[PDB]
């Protein structure tokens, strides 16, 4: 029951949790969605009927009935959060606000050629939440073209005022555009001593770090594990920051872990989605309900289906003697976390999966199935698609990868002498070519996007996008794959897979059942040595030492997520010599601008 629609001139009476300041009601709704308690909100827009102090007031509310009394008021905009909704959600707001000054701690001031450039700085910076930028037209001269960066405890501005000839906007780290490097490397037996800006109780360091990530002020963190000596401090997740933006010192200690915010790589990593169960762990919180459940799995589904429930502990029928109906405790707290974490009273705890819809769908797990080297099989590579040509007669043309609901990502060289999209057929989730028949269902390609600069495969820009006529219902058979995040350029991928039907040209011949081969990456420079006749750009990556087709995916698995590191472009020829691929990372800005 998503009421996505905002409510004009309406105020929701009472139930306030807190008050923040947002540029729009529309952003208020996002803030409400992402706060652990908020079901609904009331925004106060700029207007005579209200004093300047209360404009941009965004009031986060909760109700046990899940709603509140509506009273009309001028300038009041009110909504419900998206927790209640099936549709995916994003925290990424690209709005520039004209004549708006969003106040905060101003930690840096400089000259910028424009709002956009000011914003790329806000985004590329470790501390930046939102920026304000003074235009030329700005009367006071030495202030002209100053782009000043700010941060707050909450990530939202302490106040908002109208100041003409100025533009404010938010960091785009959550639009997946930041060039800031993510440090995924986690330090066991380590602690950090710097400003502690908040603290939660976490079941492990993974959740700790996830929590660090979506917390606006948290740059790095320390976790005091269950095995920590001081009892009071166990499972305590400490969220830290510093003026440099780095840990002042690495102190050595046992049973504590440290790490960093992943805010940059936010889109390729599970963040709000905690799918593990925690056994003989009980999560202390406020009790919402207690119900009969057959298992901790249905326990969780009850949690997820209960909108106020943030977490649960399931208590199983006792010690295998008892009838198998357990007790499901639906819990909540003030942040979305446990107040206390207790080990050894034999409950099974986890979180609400209602959160997961905030994650990018390319982060969801893939059922284990069977790992057979010889052949691929159902659901194994949900992103890979086969790209078919009608002319002369219908046959496999290329490989492609689903990077979107509406999008395939593939090679440009695949479209050589293709006169229109109208001849293209994209099939999804196909194991066998034999499997395709006249009745087989497929996606029509609405549009082919080839790189402005593309000329030839061995020239660099071999990449293309397909926009589909019709969006994909994701299924264990057909899913997206994540694009490498720019913050990850230094990641070392040790597990990589070329998939496809084996078409690098009509000769060679083709393949029926989808083929899969794990392949080592090879360094550019080492690659440059095997290819003398040709150059190898920073926009190309190699591998080998090759069952894939043209436009086919190079899928690297990192931290339990699949990334599309490269697209098969020209490798001449199975030999030894590695395939040369396009470097997807290097095209991120490009893909994003094209897909939005």
């Amino acid at each position: 029951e998503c009421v996505t629609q905002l409510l004009k001139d309406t105020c929701f009476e009472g139930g306030d949790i807190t008050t923040v300041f947002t540029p729009s009601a529309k952003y208020c709704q996002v803030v409400c969605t992402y706060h652990p308690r908020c079901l609904l909100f009331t925004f106060t827009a700029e207007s005579p009927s209200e004093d300047p102090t209360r404009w941009f007031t965004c009031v986060l509310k909760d109700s046990v009935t899940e709603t509140l009394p509506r009273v009309n008021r001028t300038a009041a905009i009110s909504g419900y959060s998206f927790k209640q909704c099936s549709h995916q959600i994003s925290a990424c707001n690209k709005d520039i606000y004209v004549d708006l000054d969003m106040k905060g701690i101003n930690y840096n001031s400089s000259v910028a050629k424009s709002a956009q450039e000011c914003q790329e700085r806000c985004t590329d910076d470790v501390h930046c939440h939102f920026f304000t930028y003074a235009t030329r037209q700005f009367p006071s001269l030495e202030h002209r073209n100053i782009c000043l960066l700010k941060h707050t405890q909450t990530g939202t501005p302490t106040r908002i005022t109208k100041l003409d000839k100025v533009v404010s906007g938010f960091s785009l780290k959550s639009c997946a555009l930041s060039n800031l490097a993510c440090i995924r490397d986690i330090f066991p037996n380590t602690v950090f001593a710097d400003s502690n800006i908040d603290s939660v109780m976490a079941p492990d360091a993974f959740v700790c770090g996830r929590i660090c990530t979506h917390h606006p002020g948290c740059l790095f963190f320390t976790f005091f594990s269950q095995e920590w000596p001081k009892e009071s401090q166990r499972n305590l997740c400490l969220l830290k920051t510093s003026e440099s933006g780095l840990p002042s010192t690495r102190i050595k200690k046992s049973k504590a872990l440290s790490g960093f915010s992943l805010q940059s790589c936010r889109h390729s990593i599970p963040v709000f989605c905690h799918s593990s169960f925690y056994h003989d762990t009980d999560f202390l919180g406020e009790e919402l309900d207690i119900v009969a459940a057959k298992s901790h799995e249905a326990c969780q589904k009850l949690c997820t289906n209960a909108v106020r429930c943030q977490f649960f502990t399931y208590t199983p029928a006792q010690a295998s003697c008892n009838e198998g109906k357990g007790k499901c405790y639906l819990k909540l707290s003030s942040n979305g976390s446990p107040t206390k974490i207790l080990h050894g009273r034999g409950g099974i705890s986890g979180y609400t999966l209602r959160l997961c819809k905030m994650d990018n769908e390319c982060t969801t797990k893939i059922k284990p199935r069977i790992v057979g080297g010889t052949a691929s099989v159902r659901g194994e590579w949900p992103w890979q698609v086969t790209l078919h040509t009608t002319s002369p007669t219908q046959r496999h043309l290329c490989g492609g990868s689903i990077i979107g609901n509406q999008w395939i990502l593939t090679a440009a060289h695949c479209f050589y002498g293709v006169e229109s999209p109208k001849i293209l057929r994209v099939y999804s989730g196909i194991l066998n070519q034999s499997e395709i028949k006249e009745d087989t269902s497929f996606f029509g390609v609405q549009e082919i996007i080839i790189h402005d600069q593309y000329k030839m495969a061995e020239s660099g820009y071999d990449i293309a996008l397909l926009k589909l006529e019709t969006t994909v219902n994701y299924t264990d058979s057909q899913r997206p794959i994540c694009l490498p995040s720019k913050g990850d350029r230094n990641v070392i991928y040790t597990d990589c897979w070329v998939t496809g039907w084996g078409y690098r040209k009509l000769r060679d011949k083709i393949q029926n059942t989808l083929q899969k081969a794990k392949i080592p990456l090879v360094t550019n420079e080492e690659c440059q040595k095997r290819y003398r006749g040709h150059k190898i750009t920073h926009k190309m990556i190699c591998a080998g030492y090759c069952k894939g087709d043209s436009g086919g995916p190079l899928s690297c698995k990192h931290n339990e997520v699949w990334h599309l590191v490269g697209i098969t472009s020209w490798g001449e020829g199975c030999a030894e010599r590695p395939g040369v691929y396009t470097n997807v990372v290097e095209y991120v800005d490009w893909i994003l601008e094209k897909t939005q």
Partner: peptide, 8 residues
Amino acid sequence: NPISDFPD
């Protein structure tokens, strides 16, 4: 950090 707010 000294940084000053834009004049009204």
